[PDB]
């Protein structure tokens, strides 16, 4: 299942007096933590969200984000005039560690949707898109030895130890195999659009194609793998053909949960 743990940030600045931060905890596409901004407390979305960490380390982590979120807005609102920024603007952030080809930690920043900074060998690498602001900010944040030293321990010491423990604490919900459900339907456009629906599969990798007996059809138009509540996926594979062409056609679905017996729907 998932191989990376990361926390995300979205701070919305409307006027010189108002700001609002949004944060959450993720195992790739699956949300395990939330953040209640009103109290400054994390929301454990699964019983195994705390991993193997005791309530002593979980509370310490919650405090760092509580302090970080509360303090984040006043720092950037005061330095908004310094970096010639005009309201409204939006800050984004992502950080955490990922198992690779062996764990690799990461941190990324973004203003107005465009890249702002990245971290390589515990250093403020600006982003070419960010411009002079990214150059000024990385030259400014270096001085904040308290912030710099906390992000180090969080990236390279507490995160890798957390990633391993949370993957194991909830393998029953990460490694599980959910069988999908498939059905067929007709599209609007003599000519017909043959729609196939595969709903409720887990994990995300899936094989879906339209077939002529044992022969694949190159003209299949696989849609976006859309999120389905809760922790399942949704997909549609369309086919545009003649009115007579429909005869002898089938939608074939292959997934890990299916264990050899693939979903074969004719029409």
């Amino acid at each position: 299942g998932p191989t990376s743990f990361h926390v995300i940030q979205t701070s919305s600045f409307t006027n010189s007096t108002w700001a609002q931060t949004q944060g959450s905890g993720w195992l790739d596409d699956l949300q395990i933590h939330g953040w209640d901004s009103d109290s400054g407390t994390a929301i454990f979305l699964k019983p195994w969200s705390k991993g193997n960490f005791s309530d002593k380390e979980v509370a310490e982590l919650e405090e760092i984000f509580r302090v970080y979120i509360f303090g984040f807005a006043r720092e950037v609102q005061d330095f908004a005039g310094d970096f010639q920024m005009k309201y409204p603007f939006e800050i984004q952030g992502i950080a955490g560690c990922e198992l690779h080809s062996a764990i690799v930690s990461f941190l990324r920043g973004a203003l107005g949707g465009l890249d702002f900074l990245s971290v390589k060998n515990a250093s403020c690498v600006p982003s070419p898109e960010g411009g002079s602001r990214a150059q000024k900010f990385c030259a400014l944040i270096i001085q904040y030895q308290g912030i710099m030293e906390t992000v180090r321990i969080l990236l390279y010491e507490t995160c890798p130890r957390y990633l391993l423990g949370v993957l194991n604490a909830g393998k029953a919900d990460l490694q599980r195999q959910v069988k999908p459900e498939a059905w067929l339907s007709s599209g609007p456009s003599g000519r017909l659009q043959l729609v196939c629906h595969v709903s409720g599969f887990y994990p995300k990798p899936v094989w879906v194609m339209w077939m002529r007996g044992e022969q694949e059809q190159q003209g299949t138009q696989l849609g976006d793998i859309l999120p389905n509540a809760n922790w399942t996926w949704y997909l549609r594979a369309t086919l545009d053909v003649a009115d007579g062409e429909a005869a002898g056609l089938s939608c074939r679905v292959k997934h890990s949960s299916l264990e050899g017996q693939d979903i074969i729907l004719y029409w």
Partner: T-cell receptor
Amino acid sequence: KTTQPPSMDCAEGRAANLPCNHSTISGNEYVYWYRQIHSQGPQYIIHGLKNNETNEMASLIITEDRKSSTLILPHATLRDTAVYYCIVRVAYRQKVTFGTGTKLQVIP
Amino acid sequence: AGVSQSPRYKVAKRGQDVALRCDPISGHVSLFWYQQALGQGPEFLTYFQNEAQLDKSGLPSDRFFAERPEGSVSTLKIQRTQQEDSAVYLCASSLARAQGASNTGELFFGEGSRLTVLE
């Protein structure tokens, strides 16, 4: 969790080395020194989380080992007779805990 | 620019209520209350982040109560004062801003309020 000698005599004009012990002193645990004169509240002297600092009043040296710190008063004056407190503060924490400190006696 | 504590000295009759005030430096988000007994270091009582009392673990009894309604001026109220309450109540404020270069992040203490409780 800091430990410091309860008393210390220093000769006037000499350097006063004020020792402080703390088991961890993490990369983000700070070291703050405060001074307290009779019938007064504590006053900030110097701080440092990594780099040894050298301000206009004193100098702070954190061991590369990080399990002890020392406050250096280059030339002790009579005005330096006070209780010196060594406090550790994790970067994101606001609460500051004071121990019993060191009673520095600058002998005229 | 300093923290003002009042009354600087207070004589009180045992069983009476006493109210200690602390006017911190304008803009300082953090406000801390401490109690200091003879030959001992300051002891934490309560901490405020603006008007919110986030940690009050150091309060000696049911009778000690602190408030900062507008997130500036604080008042430590001691009810039914006892002889054991005789101490120097210290108040400190701190900017609570990220510490870069020239930001000491220090605690600015008041002059203190010496409380003496007599029968």
